[PDB]
Design an enzyme around this catalytic site. Structure first.
Site, mmCIF file in Angstrom:
data_model
loop_
_atom_site.group_PDB
_atom_site.id
_atom_site.type_symbol
_atom_site.label_atom_id
_atom_site.label_comp_id
_atom_site.label_asym_id
_atom_site.label_seq_id
_atom_site.Cartn_x
_atom_site.Cartn_y
_atom_site.Cartn_z
ATOM 1 N N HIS A 61 1.140 -1.265 -0.005
ATOM 2 C CA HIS A 61 -0.177 0.015 0.183
ATOM 3 C C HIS A 61 0.802 1.308 0.112
ATOM 4 C CE1 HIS A 61 -3.340 -2.699 0.909
ATOM 5 N NE2 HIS A 61 -2.790 -3.288 1.941
ATOM 6 N N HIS A 91 5.581 6.575 6.634
ATOM 7 C CA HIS A 91 5.388 6.067 5.267
ATOM 8 C C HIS A 91 4.985 7.446 4.710
ATOM 9 C CE1 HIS A 91 1.763 5.964 7.796
ATOM 10 N NE2 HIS A 91 1.122 6.272 6.438
HETATM 11 N N1 LIG Z 1 -2.334 6.637 7.111
HETATM 12 S S1 LIG Z 1 -1.883 6.458 8.728
HETATM 13 O O1 LIG Z 1 -3.268 7.032 9.494
HETATM 14 O O2 LIG Z 1 -0.722 7.245 9.351
HETATM 15 C C1 LIG Z 1 -1.595 4.803 9.292
HETATM 16 C C2 LIG Z 1 -1.590 3.928 8.171
HETATM 17 C C3 LIG Z 1 -1.370 2.680 8.590
HETATM 18 C C4 LIG Z 1 -1.232 2.190 9.828
HETATM 19 C C5 LIG Z 1 -0.971 0.651 10.134
HETATM 20 O O3 LIG Z 1 -0.261 0.482 11.355
HETATM 21 C C6 LIG Z 1 -1.890 -0.437 9.402
HETATM 22 S S2 LIG Z 1 -1.209 -1.830 10.166
HETATM 23 C C7 LIG Z 1 -2.207 -2.013 11.361
HETATM 24 N N2 LIG Z 1 -3.181 -1.188 11.688
HETATM 25 C C8 LIG Z 1 -3.893 -1.424 12.805
HETATM 26 C C9 LIG Z 1 -3.602 -2.554 13.661
HETATM 27 C C10 LIG Z 1 -2.920 -3.317 13.146
HETATM 28 N N3 LIG Z 1 -1.947 -3.383 12.182
HETATM 29 C C11 LIG Z 1 -1.001 2.980 10.942
HETATM 30 C C12 LIG Z 1 -1.417 4.413 10.504
HETATM 31 CL CL1 LIG Z 1 -1.467 5.565 11.795
HETATM 32 ZN ZN LIG Z 2 -0.462 7.336 6.458
#
Ligand SMILES: NS(=O)(=O)c1ccc(C(=O)CSc2ncccn2)cc1Cl
Ligand SMILES: [Zn+2]
Length: 257
Positions: A61, A91
């Site tokens: 992603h 990221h």
């Molecule tokens: N776009 S963003 O809001 O900064 C963001 C995107 C992906 C994830 C992940 O860690 C997704 S993997 C995951 N998420 C919840 C629970 C177990 N694994 C975390 C964040 Cl804060």
């Molecule tokens: Zn993000």
């Protein structure tokens, strides 16, 4: 199965993750005129001196640069926050074109890209437990515009060739994320969500007013990455952003006028 295409992109996420339509989803458009100045907001404290990058991953992603979060090394505190949040990963989201790519927008303006430095509240002991809490995460959002190169980003851009496709990882030690910061730490803040599934409503969003500049050649290399895995037909990793979601009740506060 979720992704960023016509058949599995953000408009479809609510079928697997009904919270997609919830009360505090991200990103949002930041109306700079209606954001409330809050003189009681503290300066944001970024202690990244002892950061330990470990690894860079293509998760299909985006790419993640991951940090050792087993002790308080790289921490966010102050600003609107009440505890200490450890950096776990950063990221980006970016566009197919320089005219789009950011998740948050500023008076409807889209930036070429958006950096997310994801941190989790030390009180919850780990990232997995933190995401189940309403104050579990703090994500520092920084916009990218295209002009001058960001020298501190080049170390990241040069390894992307090694993680072209979904599931690839490379060692990525001694990267200093302080080289990704703009000069000012003035910020907007509001309560929101992950912007990808599972879309958990556990985030305090701290979005910097001042964008960093990256070169057209730096962002071009982001665009050579792939959503597909190594055995598969090429789908460029582009437009991996979620559009602005309804603000609903919420107030966006500003640390500045
Ligand atoms: N776009 S963003 O809001 O900064 C963001 C995107 C992906 C994830 C992940 O860690 C997704 S993997 C995951 N998420 C919840 C629970 C177990 N694994 C975390 C964040 Cl804060
Ligand atoms: Zn993000």
């Amino acid at each position: 199965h979720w992704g960023y295409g016509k058949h599995n992109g953000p408009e479809h996420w609510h079928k697997d993750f009904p919270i997609a339509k919830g009360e505090r989803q991200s990103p949002v458009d930041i109306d700079t005129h209606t954001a409330k100045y809050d003189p009681s907001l503290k300066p944001l404290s970024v202690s990244y001196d002892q950061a330990t990058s470990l690894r860079i991953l293509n998760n299909g992603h985006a790419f993640n640069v991951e940090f050792d979060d087993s002790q308080d090394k790289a921490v966010l505190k102050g600003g609107p926050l009440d505890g200490t949040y450890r950096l776990i990963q950063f990221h980006f989201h970016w566009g197919s074109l320089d005219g789009q790519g950011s998740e948050h927008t500023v008076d409807k303006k889209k930036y070429a890209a958006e950096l997310h430095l994801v941190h989790w509240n030390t009180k919850y002991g780990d990232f997995g437990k933190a995401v189940q809490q309403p104050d579990g995460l703090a994500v520092l959002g920084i916009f990218l515009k295209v002009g001058s190169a960001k020298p501190g980003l080049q170390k990241v851009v040069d390894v992307l060739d090694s993680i072209k496709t979904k599931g690839k990882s490379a060692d990525f030690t001694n990267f200093d994320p302080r080289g990704l910061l703009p000069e000012s730490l003035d910020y907007w803040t509001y309560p929101g969500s992950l912007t990808t599934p599972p879309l958990l409503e556990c985030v305090t969003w701290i979005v910097l007013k001042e964008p960093i500049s990256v070169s057209s050649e730096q962002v071009l290399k982001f665009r050579k990455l792939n959503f597909n895995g190594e055995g598969e037909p090429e789908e460029l990793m582009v437009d991996n952003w979620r559009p602005a979601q309804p603000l609903k009740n919420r107030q966006i506060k500003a640390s500045f006028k």
